[PDB]
Each structure stands twice: as C-alpha cells, then as structure tokens.
C-alpha cells in the first residue's frame, strides 16, 4: 500500500462528539447513552507536506464517503467546509494544501492546524449544538484541542 490510512473519531476538551448536521455541515455536541454510535469516523491518510515528530500532515475525510474537510477563504475569512472530491481520483498521497491538515501533538491533546492557513486550527465553542469552524486563537475561548480514538475499521 503506497498510502496508508486509519480511521478514528475526534472529541473536544468537553468530550463532545462530532456529528453530521447537514450534507456539508458538522456539529459538535455531547453524545452519551446509547446514542454514542451515531459518531462520525474520519479517515486519516498519510499525505505529503510539513512532517515532524510532533506535527504530522494528514487528510481528513468521512469514512466511506467522498466528503472531505476543506479550508478555504470565504468573504475574506478562512472557513472550513465539506468538498465532494472525485470518488475515483481520491484519496491520494499528494492532496491539495486546502485538504492537508497538520495534526500536531504538543501534550496529551492533539491540535489540527491548517496547512493552507498557518496558526489556524479547527475550533468549536464550549456551548452545546455548536457547528465546527476554523479559529486562529488556540487556547482561547473556543476549543482548539481534540482527542483521537481508533475504531474497528
């Protein structure tokens, strides 16, 4: 296998789970009880980009779906969105910089910096039922740290 890929789930500092709101919308909320299995799993591909011992360049796409997380500028502001990439031409090792995330691990928590937008990480508000957006204030009010849980394929 030229490009390896694993599947894992992401949770915020409040232990919230990422769920698909609309076809191209992601939300972060508390998921417990027997509703935990509604969790969305993301596939991490070993792409090409800025690599280090702490920061690893990986792609983020929905498991068994051609929906990938993309970082673009909308109205002079960097925003996150879901792009429907070619189902037969994706994924690939050399992915577009807007689809390349810099998964860093400073301590026990992991941070996802955008390769397209340096110092901009995936953020989510502390509040419940809040959507996912791109923030440039890591360690501020909005959650900028996440967890990684490997699932069964």
């Amino acid at each position, epitope marked *: *296998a030229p490009v*390896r890929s*694993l*599947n894992c789930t992401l949770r915020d*500092s409040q232990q919230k789970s990422l769920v698909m709101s609309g076809p191209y919308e992601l939300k972060a909320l508390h998921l417990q009880g027997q509703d935990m299995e509604q969790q969305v799993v993301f596939s991490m591909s070993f792409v090409q980009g800025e690599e280090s*011992n702490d920061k690893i360049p990986v792609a983020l796409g929905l498991k068994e779906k051609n929906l990938y997380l993309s970082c673009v500028l909308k109205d002079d502001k960097p925003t996150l969105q879901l792009e429907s990439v070619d189902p037969k031409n994706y994924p690939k090792k050399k992915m577009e910089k807007r689809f390349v995330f810099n998964k860093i*691990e400073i*301590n*026990n*928590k*992991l941070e996802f910096e955008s390769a397209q937008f340096p110092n901009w990480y995936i953020s989510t508000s502390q509040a419940e039922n809040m959507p996912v957006f791109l923030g440039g204030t890591k360690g501020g009010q909005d959650i900028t740290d996440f*967890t*990684m*849980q*490997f*699932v*069964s*394929s």
Partner: single-chain antibody, 248 residues
Framework: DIQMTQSPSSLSASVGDRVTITCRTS??????LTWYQQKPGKAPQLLIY???TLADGVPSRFSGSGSGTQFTLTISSLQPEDFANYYC?????????FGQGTKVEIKRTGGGGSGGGGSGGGGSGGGGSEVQLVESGGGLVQPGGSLRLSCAAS????????MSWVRQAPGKRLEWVAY????????YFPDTVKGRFTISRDNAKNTLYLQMNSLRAEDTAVYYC????????????WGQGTLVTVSS
C-alpha cells in the same frame, strides 16, 4: 480487522542454530512490527520493536527483519534459555492484537545437567534501580458482575511514562484492553471493549485502577500491566498478570 499469521507454530533446533520466525499481517503496515518473548511462568519482554530496532539490554543474538506485509525474526544463535513463545504484533491500527505464537524448542541429545542459571545481576532487587509492576485484584466473580484491577508502579516515572492494558487468555494470544493517558483526556477504547472497561490513575499511590463492569464469559483471561516509553504505541515492560475468572 488486521489479523496476524505466524509460521511456524513450534520448531526444534540445536544450540547455536539460526532460528527463523515468519510473521505476516493482513495489512501492509510497512514498518510497524513488534516482537515479544514470554518466558514460561514469567512476564513477557520486548526484544524487537519498530520492525528492526533492538531493545536496550536485549541480547545481540536477537535480530529482527522484514518490511511491508512480511516480517521475520532471526536468532543468530539459539540458546537453551531462549525456550519461550514468540508472538509478533502490529502498532499501526486496530485491533492491536498478536499472532498465533511460535514456540522454539531446543533439541538436545542429553548432556546431563543441561539448563542454565538464574536471572539478574549486580544490584538486582537491592542496591540499584529496579522497574517493577505488580497487579492485584484478580479473582472469581459471577457473570455480569464487576471487578477493580489495580497495578502498582515502581522504579520509574509515573507522570512521565504512559501505560496501557493488555490481556492474554490461557492458551491464546494477547489482546488490547485499553489505554490510560498520563494526562487524563484522550481515552482510546476499541468498539469491542467500548463501555465495558474504564480506566483511572492515581499519581499519589502510584497505581492504576481498571474498572471492569458488565463482564462476560469472553472476558475470562489474564490481565497484564503494560507500559510505553515513547510517543508510539508499544509496550516495553509487562507486569506479572492477574487472573480473572467469571463463573457461578
């Protein structure tokens, strides 16, 4: 998931022979293979890690090779003390299980007192550093019940070293149970054991607490304390193991 396949299961060689153990994976991990040695009645030890990296303190007669989807262990010179079960492992993704196990038997004609001595050196258990993990809490419990396993950590950094939990049923391979972060957040739990177990750590008493709820008959096995040492998911030190049996 990613299964493992070893060859052979058992073999007989002479003292000084070049033993070769083949290990195959169901997924092209490329370079994420681990090799462990479990002595009869003792705790398993990490001989080879990262596919081709020897452990610090491991005899030079132990060499590891392989790349891609095929790995091989090579013993430059098989000694009578090398009698044990060799189980490989992958640290790339789930389920983090071991192979079938390869047993190496030393075929000796008969030299009278052919065996060896003990283990240890100057300072062992006395004037010197000694890393030890002692688990407790095991016993016989009724199905559906609960049990709290505790592992005592000593001889090393408790807040600098991370650890995990692995179980091995009598006459079976080793299966991952859970991960217990030194920080206290990232909770790695496979869908298989998800919800069944819960981990907790005490930095004051230097002990790990494993809460086992809604135990099933398939949970019957030995629980060994596993410890890491880097940023990768590998164990370099195993505890003695606590036997847990669920019956009526």
């Amino acid at each position: 998931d990613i299964q493992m396949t070893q060859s052979p299961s058992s073999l007989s060689a002479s003292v000084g022979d070049r033993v070769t153990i083949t290990c195959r994976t169901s997924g092209n991990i490329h370079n994420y293979l681990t090799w462990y040695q479990q002595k009869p009645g003792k705790a398993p030890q990490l001989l080879i890690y990262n596919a081709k990296t020897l452990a610090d303190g491991v005899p030079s007669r132990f060499s590891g090779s392989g790349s891609g989807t095929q790995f091989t262990l090579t013993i430059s010179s098989l000694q009578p003390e090398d009698f044990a079960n060799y189980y490989c492992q992958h640290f790339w993704s789930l389920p983090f299980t071991f192979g079938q196990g390869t047993k190496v038997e030393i075929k000796r004609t008969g030299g009278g007192g052919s065996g060896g001595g003990g283990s240890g050196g100057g300072g062992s258990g006395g004037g010197g550093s000694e890393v030890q993990l002692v688990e407790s809490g095991g016993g016989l419990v009724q199905p559906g019940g609960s049990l709290r396993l505790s592992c005592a950590a000593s001889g090393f950094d408790f807040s600098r070293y991370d650890m995990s939990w692995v179980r091995q049923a009598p006459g079976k391979r080793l299966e991952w149970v859970a991960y217990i972060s030194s920080g206290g957040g990232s909770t790695y739990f496979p869908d298989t054991v998800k919800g069944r177990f819960t981990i907790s750590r005490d930095n004051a008493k230097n002990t790990l607490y494993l809460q086992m709820n809604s135990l099933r008959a398939e949970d019957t096995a030995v629980y060994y304390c596993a410890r890491q040492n880097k940023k990768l998911t590998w164990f370099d030190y195993w505890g003695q193991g606590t036997l847990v049996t669920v019956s009526s």
